[PDB]
Structure 1
Amino acid sequence: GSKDYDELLKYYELHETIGTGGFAKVKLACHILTGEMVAIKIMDKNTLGSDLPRIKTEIEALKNLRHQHICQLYHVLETANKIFMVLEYCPGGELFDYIISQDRLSEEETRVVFRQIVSAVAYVHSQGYAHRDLKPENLLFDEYHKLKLIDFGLCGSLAYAAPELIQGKSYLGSEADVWSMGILLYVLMCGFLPFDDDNVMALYKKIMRGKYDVPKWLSPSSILLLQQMLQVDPKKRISMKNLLNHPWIMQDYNYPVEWQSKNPFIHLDDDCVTELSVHHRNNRQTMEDLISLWQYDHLTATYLLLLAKKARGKPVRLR
């Protein structure tokens, strides 16, 4: 109802719907106080049904994941019938779009993108999580052409799922993510899937078999990294630690993947704390302690959006 939007519309101006993926809608919106554009995931609690616990799973995970290549959660607002998630806006489109418009990426272009994927996923695993749904549709570009991983509903698409997922057997989520990243690496450099079939049963068999075509344009180093990631035996898959400084990964770079987060939880920006304090009528030390609770209310949304507004070189001012 209109009651479900009262608190929301005190903080954001709604623009057009930019996507109806899954069972939720995502709208473009503008944070009134800072002017920064955000994405708002709208969910109807009476409609989510049994997919509703997975929404709590994604929120709890997003509250615990803060990293330059993970879509940032700014604000969680729950009403009587709606759950609102205010997220980092990614106008650059999906990695799916980038691949399909450049029928395939070169090895150099692939390394630029893949190193960001390895960065996000390695950080996810360092926090005790596994994504379990890695796919080009879940990686978006911002306005700086930097990748952002989205959709933590599981902590999946069949062509990216590891064979042990297909059989329904037990599995470690981290090893399942490495397989999907191997499928990602193949798609990035070939433009098509390594295992594909119009019939699901035939795709089941092709995945579990593990054999795939190796196009002629793949470098020898690309091939061996692929077979190091696309191992049917999950215990023979390359680990994440070995991926961070893998020879292929480091070609043209000569430094391992910077997987650790730079967006902190501890340190606060004094310019942002100052601008916030002179806008809520309370002393600065109280404003500093309130921000540090990280409730993902309007306060933390305003802080991190003002933080991002500052990084863009815009004046660190409110409204």
Structure 2
Amino acid sequence: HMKDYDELLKYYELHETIGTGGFAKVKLACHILTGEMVAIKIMDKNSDLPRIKTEIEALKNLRHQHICQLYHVLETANKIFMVLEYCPGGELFDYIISQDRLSEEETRVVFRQIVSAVAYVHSQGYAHRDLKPENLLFDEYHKLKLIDFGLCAKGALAYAAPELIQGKSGSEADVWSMGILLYVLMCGFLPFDDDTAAALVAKIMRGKYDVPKWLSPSSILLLQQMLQVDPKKRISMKNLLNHPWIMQDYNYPVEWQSKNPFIHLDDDCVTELSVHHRNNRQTMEDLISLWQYDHLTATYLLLLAKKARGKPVRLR
């Protein structure tokens, strides 16, 4: 047997680890009924436990095309499992460091996905508080997914906002980190960087940085607005979404609004579930809208993704 893995292994076929981290691990798996690939964050529950519990609560309320999806939560004797969206494309961090620097046009394709995700987070009354390129992953279609909501509220020093260091705690800090991200994408180096943490802090607080020769005046202007030391003088989310730089080859503002619904349900997905549970229709729809994040939330959301990639609405 194994009593920690009995409930899990009714629903998932467990694959390669590709995980390690003292308390937390990540294992590849396959959802048995849909055939669909997932990633499982297996926890050794025993410590840092109600910061796993805040992440789960945030993710249960956040549903978005640029936020990596939670399907299922399972809890045993010495485990918490989190069944999550499959992101084989790697970190955004892995792209920056392996190559030199993206073009303005290349950075815009990527940055508009970061803005869409973060504007949705803030609309839900949350702040991520750990925005960095390690925390943005690519799916199998090369689209960005915001991960790790472990520091979220209703991080890395180089990305940290002056007021966050200098003793005030909320979503103005996220705009700053997006400005650090913007700079690294286009330059290939951080705007504030030092050999000692005490000299890094001093540079952030002062707020002076290099303006490379290759940067356009449009790029220089967005950077100055986002990298304001006073969080009151930093660009608002509303003005970011439709900024001239943001729309500079796209003749339209960032679509930050979710295409992943909580309150409207796919009929092909409800009929194909009514076949398995042998319910009527009203019974199946009423059960799904509970969003308990059990096997039913898992099967439905992995059915919704199955039709999206062309394949039929079919359970095995």
Q: TM-score, normalised by structure 1?
A: 0.96
1:22–1:244: structure 2 CA closer, same or farther, 3 Å change rule? farther
Contact 2:90 2:138 in 1 (8 A): yes
Q: Distance in 1 between matches of 2:140 and 2:288?
A: 27
Contact 2:18 2:28 in 1 (8 A): yes
Contact 2:23 2:45 in 1 (8 A): no
Of the structure 1 ranges 175-184 and 209-218, higher mean CA displacement relative to structure 2 is found in 209-218
SS at match of 1:76: strand
CA-to-aligned-CA distance 1:119-150 (integer Å, 9 cap, x gap):
00000000000000000000000011111000
1:74–1:310: structure 2 CA closer, same or farther, 3 Å change rule? same
Q: Distance in 1 between matches of 2:130 and 2:43?
A: 20
1:111–1:198: structure 2 CA closer, same or farther, 3 Å change rule? same
1:114–1:21: structure 2 CA closer, same or farther, 3 Å change rule? farther
CA-to-aligned-CA distance 1:35-82 (integer Å, 9 cap, x gap):
110011111111xxx421111110000000000000101001111221
1:120–1:22: structure 2 CA closer, same or farther, 3 Å change rule? farther
Contact 2:91 2:137 in 1 (8 A): yes
Query: Which of residues 86, 95, 113 is equivalent to 1:116?
Result: 113
Q: Distance in 1 between matches of 2:265 and 2:91?
A: 31
Residue equivalent to 1:27: 27
Of the structure 1 ranges 222-231 and 99-108, higher mean CA displacement relative to structure 2 is found in 99-108
Matched residue count: 312
CA-to-aligned-CA distance 1:68-110 (integer Å, 9 cap, x gap):
0001010011112211000001011111112223311110010
Query: Which of residues 226, 230, 244 is equivalent to 2:227?
Result: 230
SS at match of 1:299: helix
Residue equivalent to 2:186: 189
Using the TM superposition, give the Cα deviation of residue 197 of structure 1 relative to its aligned residue in structure 2, in angstroms. 1.0
Using the TM superposition, give the Cα deviation of residue 166 of structure 1 relative to its aligned residue in structure 2, in angstroms. 1.4
SS at match of 1:17: coil
Using the TM superposition, give the Cα deviation of residue 315 of structure 1 relative to its aligned residue in structure 2, in angstroms. 1.4
Using the TM superposition, give the Cα deviation of residue 24 of structure 1 relative to its aligned residue in structure 2, in angstroms. 1.1
Using the TM superposition, give the Cα deviation of residue 22 of structure 1 relative to its aligned residue in structure 2, in angstroms. 7.3
Using the TM superposition, give the Cα deviation of residue 282 of structure 1 relative to its aligned residue in structure 2, in angstroms. 2.1
SS at match of 1:234: coil
Q: Distance in 2 between matches of 1:220 and 1:169?
A: 32
Residue equivalent to 1:12: 12
Q: Distance in 1 between matches of 2:143 and 2:278?
A: 37
Of the structure 1 ranges 182-191 and 161-170, higher mean CA displacement relative to structure 2 is found in 161-170
Q: TM-score, normalised by structure 2?
A: 0.96
Structure 2: runs of 5 or more not aligned? none
Using the TM superposition, give the Cα deviation of residue 168 of structure 1 relative to its aligned residue in structure 2, in angstroms. 2.6
Using the TM superposition, give the Cα deviation of residue 18 of structure 1 relative to its aligned residue in structure 2, in angstroms. 2.0
Contact 2:107 2:186 in 1 (8 A): yes
CA-to-aligned-CA distance 1:195-238 (integer Å, 9 cap, x gap):
11121111111111111111111111101100100011111100
SS at match of 2:245: helix
Structure 1: runs of 5 or more not aligned? none
1:195–1:43: structure 2 CA closer, same or farther, 3 Å change rule? same
CA-to-aligned-CA distance 1:226-257 (integer Å, 9 cap, x gap):
01000111111000010000000010012111
Of the structure 1 ranges 113-122 and 274-283, higher mean CA displacement relative to structure 2 is found in 274-283
Q: Distance in 2 between matches of 1:101 and 1:109?
A: 15
SS at match of 2:232: helix
Q: Distance in 2 between matches of 1:295 and 1:255?
A: 37
Q: Distance in 2 between matches of 1:42 and 1:230?
A: 37
Of the structure 1 ranges 179-188 and 78-87, higher mean CA displacement relative to structure 2 is found in 78-87
Using the TM superposition, give the Cα deviation of residue 21 of structure 1 relative to its aligned residue in structure 2, in angstroms. 5.1
Using the TM superposition, give the Cα deviation of residue 152 of structure 1 relative to its aligned residue in structure 2, in angstroms. 0.7
1:247–1:22: structure 2 CA closer, same or farther, 3 Å change rule? farther
CA-to-aligned-CA distance 1:246-300 (integer Å, 9 cap, x gap):
0000100121110010100111111111111111222222111111111000101
Q: How does 1:1-319 map to 2 (within 5 A)?
A: 3-20=3-20, 23-46=23-46, 50-155=47-152, 156-170=155-169, 173-319=170-316
Of the structure 1 ranges 283-292 and 6-15, higher mean CA displacement relative to structure 2 is found in 283-292
Q: Distance in 2 between matches of 1:6 and 1:165?
A: 43
